[PDB]
Amino acid sequence: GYDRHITIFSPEGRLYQVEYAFKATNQTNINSLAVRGKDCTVVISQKKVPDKLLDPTTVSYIFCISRTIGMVVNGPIPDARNAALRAKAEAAEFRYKYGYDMPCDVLAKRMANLSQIYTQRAYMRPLGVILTFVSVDEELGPSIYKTDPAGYYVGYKATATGPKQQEITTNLENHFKKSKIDHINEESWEKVVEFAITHMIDALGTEFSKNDLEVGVATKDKFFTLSAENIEERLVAIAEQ
Amino acid sequence: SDPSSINGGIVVAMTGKDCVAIACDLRLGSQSLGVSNKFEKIFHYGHVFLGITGLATDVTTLNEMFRYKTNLYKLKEERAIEPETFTQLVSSSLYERRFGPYFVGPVVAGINSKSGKPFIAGFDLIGCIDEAKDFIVSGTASDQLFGMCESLYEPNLEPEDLFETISQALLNAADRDALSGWGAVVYIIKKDEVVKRYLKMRQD
Amino acid sequence: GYDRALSIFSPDGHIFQVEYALEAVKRGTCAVGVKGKNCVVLGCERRSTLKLQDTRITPSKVSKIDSHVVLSFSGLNADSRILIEKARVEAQSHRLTLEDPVTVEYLTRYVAGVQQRYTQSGGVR
Amino acid sequence: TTIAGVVYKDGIVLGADTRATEGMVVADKNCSKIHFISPNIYCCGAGTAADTDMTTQLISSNLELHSLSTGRLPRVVTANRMLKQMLFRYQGYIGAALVLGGVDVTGPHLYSIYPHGSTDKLPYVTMGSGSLAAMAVFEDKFRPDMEEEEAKNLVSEAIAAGIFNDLGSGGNIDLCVISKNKLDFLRPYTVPNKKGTRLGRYRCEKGTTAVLTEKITPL
Amino acid sequence: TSIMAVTFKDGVILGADSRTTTGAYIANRVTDKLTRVHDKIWCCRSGSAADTQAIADIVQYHLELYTSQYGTPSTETAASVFKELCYENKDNLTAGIIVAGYDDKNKGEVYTIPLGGSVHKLPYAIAGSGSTFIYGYCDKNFRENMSKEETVDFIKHSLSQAIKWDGSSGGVIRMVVLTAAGVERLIFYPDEYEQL
Amino acid sequence: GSRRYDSRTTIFSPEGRLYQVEYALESISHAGTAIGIMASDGIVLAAERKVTSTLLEQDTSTEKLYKLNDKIAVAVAGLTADAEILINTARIHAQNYLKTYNEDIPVEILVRRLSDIKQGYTQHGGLRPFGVSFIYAGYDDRYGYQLYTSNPSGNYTGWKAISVGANTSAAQTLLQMDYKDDMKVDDAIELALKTLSKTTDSSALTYDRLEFATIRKGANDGEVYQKIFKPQEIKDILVKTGIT
Amino acid sequence: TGYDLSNSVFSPDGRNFQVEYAVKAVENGTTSIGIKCNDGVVFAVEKLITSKLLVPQKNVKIQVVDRHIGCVYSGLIPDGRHLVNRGREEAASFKKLYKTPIPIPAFADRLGQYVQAHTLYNSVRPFGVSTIFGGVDKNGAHLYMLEPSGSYWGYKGAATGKGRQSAKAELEKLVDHHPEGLSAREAVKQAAKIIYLAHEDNKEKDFELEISWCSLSETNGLHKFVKGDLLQEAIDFAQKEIN
Amino acid sequence: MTDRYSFSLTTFSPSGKLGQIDYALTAVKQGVTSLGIKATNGVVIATEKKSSSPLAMSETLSKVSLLTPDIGAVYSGMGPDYRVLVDKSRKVAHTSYKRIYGEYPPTKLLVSEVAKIMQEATQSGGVRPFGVSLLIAGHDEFNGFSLYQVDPSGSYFPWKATAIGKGSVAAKTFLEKRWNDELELEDAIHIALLTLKESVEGEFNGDTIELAIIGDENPDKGPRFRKLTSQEINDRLEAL
Amino acid sequence: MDIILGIRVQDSVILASSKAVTRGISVLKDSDDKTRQLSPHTLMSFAGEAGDTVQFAEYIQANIQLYSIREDYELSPQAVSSFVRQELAKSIRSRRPYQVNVLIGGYDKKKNKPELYQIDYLGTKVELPYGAHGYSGFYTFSLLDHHYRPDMTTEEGLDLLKLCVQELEKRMPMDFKGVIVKIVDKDGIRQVDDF
Ligand SMILES: *[C@@H](CS(C)(=O)=O)[C@H](Cc1ccc(CN)cc1)NC(=O)[C@@H](NC(=O)[C@H](CC(C)C)NC(=O)[C@@H](Cc1ccccc1)N=[N+]=[N-])[C@@H](C)O
Ligand SMILES: [Cl-]
Ligand SMILES: [Mg+2]
Ligand SMILES: [Mg+2]
Ligand SMILES: [Mg+2]
């Protein structure tokens, strides 16, 4: 049964190492969510600091890839950082060669094509991560693109990733069935973040403090993460209505 | 010293009404010394004709190279190469030696078998395409040929009118060049017959 | 490159890939060599399982290495062509550098040295 | 060669003559010097003709593959970078001197690219042996945000200056007008010189040339 | 070319002419020789246009990739990357680059990188063919901790003279102001600066 | 490390056989039968296509008979994709020889070259062999008309008539029975088709299940012509010989 | 089964068992710790005295990288040295290009990516060390801990090796009882105590204490070893606290 | 890091089977149905857009890809494997063909080049075969309209009409009845939409179906490849 | 090396090649054979730069002899010349080119025809009735233009060759110490020992 140790076909036409890399994805026990506004793309993710000895400021699964592109990772941190460094390098090389900022989807496809190689070549293992890229693209507008260990990628109106992804997905599905639009019809990103947090609270059934969340926001010409106090202000506004 | 004028010689090609003509001299020399009077400079790969002037070792090498390439082309495509396609192949092949080029002046001539359209083309030694309808000239008496062609040529000539035009253009140009002559060949090419004629000319 | 050690020692001090190569020779059609007082004769078997053969063009069992030396063999035919080519090249290389054709002992020693090399090189049988 | 380009209100107007020379001799009186890069980007070419041709084709080919992968129209900056970085790498030995003009998502852009790998981004440029003649016309009459038919006339007038005053330049005037709504490839835009009329017929009558032998083969 | 970078109280200002010549022909009279490698790290370029453009693009790439990983680079770091390229490829380059940038910690900083590939940190720097004519003027008139208006006038007067005497220099005087407040682009036309 | 997963494609069995060669031959035994018959005035290549649907476009299809140059053709039995790799290599070797010597490559020299490539995959590199057996039909001015075969071992042999692929045992007996040395092309055409008609695993032999070719010097002015038969022509020769 | 025989193989869980086996080698090693203080960091390690024949103070375990970073590790000592050699190459190439000495987070990812790379292929073995490291950069003090998987985080305090649970408990008390922070000289004393308390897990053989520190005030932001009087003062403080 | 897998991962088993190719074909079988039909004046290729989530924008995932202006491709099997084949097919059409001959490759030769890439994954060191079967439709001046299938082995066959993946056995039978040599392109599109309805479970409309044609030139030439819009499919579903 | 001539008559090819080997001021040898037998019915004479000449000739000889053994067959003179030309044409764009000019005189046993190929160091091949390399041709070609006929016997070829060598001995400045003459016909290669 060496067809389960390396990336070759099993008799069913399956790649077990790819499937087991997908299972490594949930090893962190963190749920992420991404939604689109009019002018923005918001990504939120659970933050868990179990050890009191940890410096909580260094515990992060959101990455600033370029100025325009943000990336949240669902999976172990070593593979996350592997993917983060490569995406940063790819985005920088792109800008140098082609003279304009790498689009979100172009990066996603590039990282997906790399992930595909690990599913076909035997010496390389897949990375045990799902990469959700976010930006406000200058051509396509607010953008969410996701990559996985299979090398699959696709654009999203909104998405969710993690152990409780199905609950979050259906919660979001039901909202967009009502509104009948592909986005959160809201001017300010502040309110789109408030939406994202609110719909995660409803879906997961848990309340959040400022230190339980991690937020990333893409606008035109910059992606940035919120501080604990910026999130606290966001949580105050949710509670007050 | 100048590789393009060690061996000498010329090629000219013309279009006519439903026909093309390509012609060359027969000389090969080592500068002043005449060596061969049987050195033909026109070759063919199916129905596409290629004249090559310049350094004779490269003339021979390129002929052998385009035979090679057009043979593989035919095996893979299951059809003979067309003049338009071959012209692009010559250009590619010359430019891939951009910084160590073949010292040659190629000339394509032929009729597109599907459209019936008469086609000629010329190149510099690194593969820039001269894509002219009227006429293409090459070799050590290229200036002479340009002058002959510009005054003698007119469009839509019948095959045997065109023969007299290209032949007189070649012969009179060659006789004003020390390194050209020693005989000549003219191909008259129609959609499904080719007439090859050797010309009588002064042997000095 | 493919480096894998295929010819290796076993606990009883045998190199099985070399010994199994001898079994391939055992399978091959019989070849015989007899030297007289002023000649050598090379006899070779041709198996008659194969009729409808064209004997003009079928690879002959005896091969000339030079104008004065011949090589016959038993075993894998495809493998024999590789030894014959190498030997023929070395025969001409010897003439070129020594200005004298190979001795039969020298040519043998070369072919034998190629065969040996393939028993302790990685990636080859 | 006289190649030029201007940025006008709605987009880009490129211009070029049609004379291909080999030393002092004119090999082609109507050759194309305005090359296709992508559907929204064109390139006028001067310098070494083969280098000009093959450099544009290669970057056009690579941009086509880039544009298929990204699914969006290519930009002028990426055409500019790819040409620039290649020409720089070859330290001037690829003698391509380009006027690159096109229209992006970000608007109209015009570049001059030099053999050594330098590029200037400009509202108007001229290159080739007739650049000074053409540049005189632009310094005389250019203004920013021109209307289309005005810009067409200015470029045409600038190429003409090159045609007549520069010996390296001649033949017809080709234009290429590029805006968001259209691409107009005008070949020829103008024929400023009539072909010289010949007074005699010097073509020989049949049987005049002396033949030794003949062979006919059918196909 | 006439280029300079001058530190002052609130930060640093870069200045340059706009003329690019091919022999005696002015190929480009509206050249932008002040090029951005980071938000508040810019450079003045002199020498081969192809070389300085190629370098500046590579530096921009390195600092973009630095920023992705380690946050905003110092002006010193930018100068070190310029230096590394210029020094290690000295045999194949003709680049005289002034690097100027604004940190909040370090405030305004100016680094000059002449032909050799050496680095020199200075209060102000002048470079390009036209700089020879203003060594005297600049040394006599420069003071440390000038105001923004004084530094704009110091650069304007200096490059005015560089332009007046150097044929290789001319056209408009472009400037780029780097302070805590942000990035301001200034332009000064011949009719303004020639009458100084 | 990686050693764990290595099949070791280039080793002897205890009996002195090459495992992968033997197993590739087993693969080839299931492929559609191909027959070559050499006459005094030409060579016949006949081959049976496999699986076939009514929806397969036959006139633009080529799985069995390939052209190496104007003098030499091959009939394939085994993996078509593997054959095409080798075919393009052979096509190049012929043109390299033509370029070097200004003469068309002799048939045996081309055959040896390909066979030597196949051999290399059995002795080094750790890769699987090519699951292909060729029948080479060719002409040159030394030996005239020649038939050869090669197989995954890299061994090649010359033949007057031969089969490869499926039912070779049965096919070779039938050929050995009816072949004669003075035979002509038109007779060999008939023998080839009759042999396939009896050894086929299909219910009947039809034009849509066959590829067919002849190498004749039978041309004007003693020059060799390769004829790859069109679907309609295979149908006509099936009626002529009386099989349909 | 067989998923644990080869490095870089995902088990059906989604785990890399070879990495988890490397962790066992780490858990087998001696106790090492790191303490983040007000303006710097302190590192300390338990060195088991196998025999009287060991020369005191000579077999040094804590290693310096560049001039401002300290590294200490538990597990296979040669693997730790190999990682520090690489760290020194990374810190050198960073300073060569960017002039400034490598920041601690930047340096942490350099080690992190390299250790992670040794979990990507079956042709290499994972590192048999957890590495505690840090120092002072332009943004202040930073303490890190890096595991065989390539995982690392920032820490207030860190501990690894056989006595890690004992140590971790002691570090957690310091974090609770000093929210305003700990001084550099205090952290040296506390480091000595914690190694002495964590020595109960390796109590058969006696040991030798080794401490190092970077502090903006006490060492000018450079890595130095605690020697002589300051070392003896820390040993005395530690000996007093166990009694 | 040494790529130590210099040896084949696809080898002959005692029965003469190449295991990994067969297993790749099993992966293709599990994949969603796609088909191709050739008319007299065109070719049509079609497949179901099997959306992994309703939150996913299935417009961004293109199963039907343009390879050249006159050649299009569709697949059944593993999407990521298809994507990298399309990348390589597009590139090889430029490097080994357009940059040499100044024109795009004919359908059969581009197919042959893709087949070669797939064969090499079936014999080279340290790789598995591609887990896709391709259906390549195209036009060129001298061969006219053509439709090819390419399998994980590298083997390729020309078709009048065919289908691959999930419901291919049933679909091929459906096409055998309906196909003739006098079909117009509109008739073929009609038959494609009928055939594809059988294998689709859920929603059947322009948003859940991807369908492209190789036909007339759309205004040097215009491109013959055209991807039908969501609206253009729905119009033909009313006349169904 | 200096003078190498060739003449193709009715039924044979005759190669004449000088005996002198001169380095600088001194004639080192007066009996040097500037030829190699490539195959039984194909002979190659050569002249050019010292060292390169023999090295090239022997290298070609080795390759043709290898072909002969491998195929048990003699290549045609046409094939041998095309091989040699390609080797020289490859050489000319090398780091250090072979400075060697050759004549290949062969008898094609298939066609029953003598054949003479002249190839220079650039790879410039021509089939001729008579040929020469270097300055020899300047004197000799005019004689051969006058006196040659395609139907000449081998003895008539040798007489015409004597007239060529006499003219070279009269008008050339260098003493080339006479010529070694070799005849290539249907029966193989033989040396005329008195000339
Ligand atoms: C005008 C350029 S200039 C001197 O700056 O005014 C034209 C531009 C141009 C651009 C594209 C095309 C067609 N694609 C044609 C013209 N340039 C030239 O005319 C150059 N001429 C050539 O390059 C000619 C081309 C032949 C086909 C007439 N080639 C030669 O002159 C040399 C080639 C060569 C070039 C460089 C190095 C070595 C050789 N000849 N030959 N043979 C301009 C160079 O004249
Ligand atoms: Cl990619
Ligand atoms: Mg793998
Ligand atoms: Mg003359
Ligand atoms: Mg001035």
CATH at residue F101: 3.60.20.10
Written as one string, the DSSP assignment of F48-61 is E--S--TTB--TT-
D2: tokens are: 């006289």
Tokens 């090499």 -> residue? H120
> Both tokens of residue H46?
């079609």
* Nearest alpha carbon to residue G213 among G159, G152, G161, G143: G143
- E strands, chain G, are 32-37, 40-48, 63-65, 69-75, 129-137, 140-146, 152-154, 157-160, 207-215, 224-225
Whether omega before D188 lies within 30 degrees of 0, making that bond cis, reads yes
User: Which residue's alpha carbon is nearest to atom 24 within ligand 1?
Assistant: D22
Under 8 Å between Cβ of B25 and B181: yes
Structural Rg of chain I based on CA atoms: 16
Give the 3-state DSSP-derived string for chain B, with helices as H, strands as E and coil as C.
CCHHHCCCCEEEEEEECCEEEEEEECCEEECCEEEECCCCCEEEECCEEEEEEECHHHHHHHHHHHHHHHHHHHHHHCCCCCHHHHHHHHHHHHHCCCCCCCCEEEEEEEECCCCCCEEEEEECCCCCEECCCCEEEEECCHHHHHHHHHHHCCCCCCHHHHHHHHHHHHHHHHCCCCCCCCCEEEEEEECCEEEEEEECCCCC
The gap between the terminal CA atoms of chain D, to the nearest Å, is 43
The amino acid that residue A44 corresponds to is I
Chain H nearest CA to G113, separation (Å): 14
Q: What angle do CA F228, F234, F236 make, to 5 degrees?
A: 130
* Cβ pair G84, G77 in contact under 8 A: no
Q: Which domains does chain A have, with CATH numbers?
A: 1-241 (3.60.20.10)
Spatial strand order of the sheet with F210-216 comes to: F161-164, F34-39, F42-48, F210-216, F225-228
Amino acid at residue number B121: A
Helix, strand and coil percent figures for chain A, each rounded to 5: 40, 20, 35
Per-residue DSSP letter, D189: E
Instruction: Choose the closest CB to A78 out of G112, G155, G157.
Output: G112
Q: Across the interface, do A100 and D82 touch by the CB < 8 Å criterion? A: no
- What residues contact residue C45 under an 8 Å CB cut-off, 6+ apart? C29, C30, C31
For I37, phi then psi, to 5°, come to -80, 110
CA–CA dist I80, I67 (Å, integer): 10
DSSP assignments along A13-74, one per residue: S--HHHHHHHHHTTTT---EEEEE-SS-EEEEEE-----TTB-GGG---EEE-SSS-EEEEE
Rounded to whole angstroms, the Cα distance separating I102 from I133 reads 8
CB proximity under 8 Å: I 152-191 to F: none
- Taking the C-alpha atoms of residue D212 and residue D215, their distance in angstroms, rounded to an integer, is 11
Q: How far apart are CA F36 and CA A129, in angstroms?
A: 57
Catalytic residue among D1, D52, D55, D56: D1
Q: How far apart are CA D48 and CA C15, in angstroms?
A: 66
CB contact under 8 A, H7 and C2: yes
How far B44 CA lies from chain F's nearest CA (Å)? 15
CB atoms within 10 A of CB H75: 30
Q: Is the CB of D1 within 6 Å of ligand 1?
A: yes
Q: Which residues from C are below 8 Å from I58, CB to CB? A: 96
**What 8-state DSSP symbol labels residue C49?**
T
* Total number of domains in chain F: 1
Q: Which residue of F has its CA nearest to A4?
A: F5
Strand partners, E3: E16, E127
Q: What stretches of chain H show up as alpha helix (H) in DSSP?
A: 19-30, 79-93, 99-101, 107-120, 168-178, 185-199, 230-238
Burial call H152-164: b when 16+ CB within 10 Å, e when fewer: bbbbbbbbbbbbb
Query: Residues in chain B whose beta carbon is closer than 8 A to a beta carbon of chain D?
Result: 47, 94-95, 98-99, 122, 124, 126-132, 142-143, 146, 151-152, 154, 157, 160-161, 163-165, 167-168, 171, 191-201
Q: Which fold has domain G1-243?
A: Glutamine Phosphoribosylpyrophosphate, subunit 1, domain 1 (3.60.20)
DSSP letters for chain I = ---EEEEE-SSEEEEEEE--EEETTEEEES----EEEEETTEEEEEEESTTHHHHHHHHHHHHHHHHHHHHTSPPPHHHHHHHHHHHHHHHTTSSS---EEEEEEEEETTTTEEEEEEE-TT--EEEESEEEETTHHHHHHHHHHHH--TT--HHHHHHHHHHHHHHHHHH-SS----EEEEEEETTEEEEE---
To the nearest whole Å, the CA of B103 is away from the closest chain H CA by 20
**Longest Cα separation, chain C:** 50
Site to substitute for ligand 1 among D28, D48, D54, D60, most atoms within 8 A of C-beta: D48
Q: For residues H172 and H154, what is the distance between their CA atoms, to the nearest angstrom?
A: 21
- For B171, the domain range is 1-204
In this complex, do C3 and H6 lie within 8 Å of one another by their Cβ atoms? yes
Which-ligand-closest: CA of B203? Answer: 4
Do the chains contact at G6 and A24, CB–CB below 8 Å?
no
The verdict on whether D119 is a catalytic residue reads no
**How many residues are present in chain A?**
241
Which positions 65-94 of D are in contact with B (Cβ < 8 Å)?
93-94
* Contact assessment for residue I4 and residue I133, using Cβ atoms and an 8 Å cutoff: yes
User: Cβ of F69 and B75 within 8 Å?
Assistant: yes
Query: Å resolution of this model?
Result: 2.9
Domains belonging to chain E, first-starting first, are 1-196 (3.60.20.10)
Long-range CB contacts for residues E144-149, cutoff 8 Å, separation at least 24: E144/E7, E145/E8, E145/E9, E146/E6, E146/E8, E146/E9, E147/E8, E147/E9, E147/E10, E148/E8, E148/E9, E148/E10, E148/E13, E148/E177, E148/E179
Domain definitions of chain G by residue range: 1-243
User: What is the experimental method?
Assistant: X-ray
**The tokens of A91 are what?**
């985005």
How many angstroms away from the CA of F205 is the closest CA of chain C?
25
> Taking a C-beta distance cutoff of 8 angstroms, is the pair H15, F132 a contact?
no
What are the structure tokens assigned to I29, written together? 């040898």
* Distance (Å, whole) CA G87 – CA G127: 14
Closest residue by Cα to atom 40, ligand 1, is: B124
Residue A97 has phi, psi (to 5 degrees) of -70, -40
Q: Are D70 and A103 in contact (CB under 8 A)?
A: yes
Best to test chain B binding among H92, H95, H100 (most B CBs inside 10 Å): H100
What ligand is nearest to the CA atom of residue E193?
Answer: 5
Number of folded domains that form chain B:
1
Q: CB of D64 closer than 6 A to ligand 1? A: no
Residues in chain I within 8 Å Cβ distance of B34: 141
**Cα angle at F170 between F164 and F176, to 5 degrees?**
85
Of C20, C50, C58, the CB nearest to F12: C20
Element (H, E) at F97: helix F80-101
The SS3 call for residue G223 is coil
Q: What's the rounded Cα separation, in Å, for the pair F213 and F199?
A: 19
Q: How far is CA F97 from CA D191, F91, F94, F106, G116, in A?
A: 53, 10, 5, 9, 53
F38 touches chain C (CB under 8 A): yes
Rounded to a whole number of angstroms, the distance from the CA of H117 to the nearest CA of chain C is: 20
The count of other CB atoms within 10 Å of the CB of residue F176 is 12
Q: Which atom, in ligand 1's list, is nearest to the CA of D97? A: 5
Residues 177-216 in F contacting H (C-alpha not used; CB under 8 Å):
none
Q: Evaluate whether G83 touches G114 at the Cβ level (below 8 Å).
A: yes
Tell whether ligand 1 has an atom less than 6 A from the beta carbon of residue D22. Answer: yes
Q: Domain D1-219 belongs to what topology?
A: Glutamine Phosphoribosylpyrophosphate, subunit 1, domain 1 (3.60.20)
Tokens 């968001």: give the residue: D180
- CB proximity list for B146: less than 8 A, separation 6 or greater: B137, D25
The bound ligand whose nearest atom lies closest to the alpha carbon of B180 is 4
Give me the CATH topology for the region I1-195: Glutamine Phosphoribosylpyrophosphate, subunit 1, domain 1 (3.60.20)
Nearest CB to H90; choose among D57, D58, D68? D68
Can you say how many angstroms the Cα of residue D76 is from the centroid of all Cα atoms in its chain? 16
The CATH number that applies at residue H12 is 3.60.20.10
Q: 3-state DSSP call for residue G172?
A: helix
DSSP states of F18-31 = BHHHHHHHHHHHTS
Q: Domain residues of chain D, as ranges?
A: 1-219
DSSP-based three-state secondary structure for E14: strand
Token pair of H122 as six digits: 């079936």
Domain ranges in chain I are 1-195
Spatial separation of the C-alpha atoms in residues H60 and A108, rounded to whole Å: 12
**Chain B residue closest to F228 (CA)?**
B78
- Whether D52 is in the pocket of ligand 1, judged by its Cβ within 6 Å, is yes
Task: Report how far ligand 4's centroid is from the alpha carbon of B140 (Å).
Answer: 11
Contact yes or no for F67 and B75 at CB 8 A: yes
Q: Which residues contact A206 (CB under 8 A, 6 or more apart)?
A: none
Q: Could you tell me if I89 lies within 8 Å of chain F, comparing CB atoms?
A: no
Q: Determine contact, residues D141/D123, Cβ cutoff 8 Å.
A: no
Residue type, E123: P
Instruction: Note whether I89 contacts B30, CB cutoff 8 Å.
Output: no
List Cα–Cα distances, I30 to E118, H235, I27, I55, in angstroms.
Answer: 67, 98, 7, 20
Give me the number of domains chain H comprises: 1
Ligand nearest to the CA of A111: 2
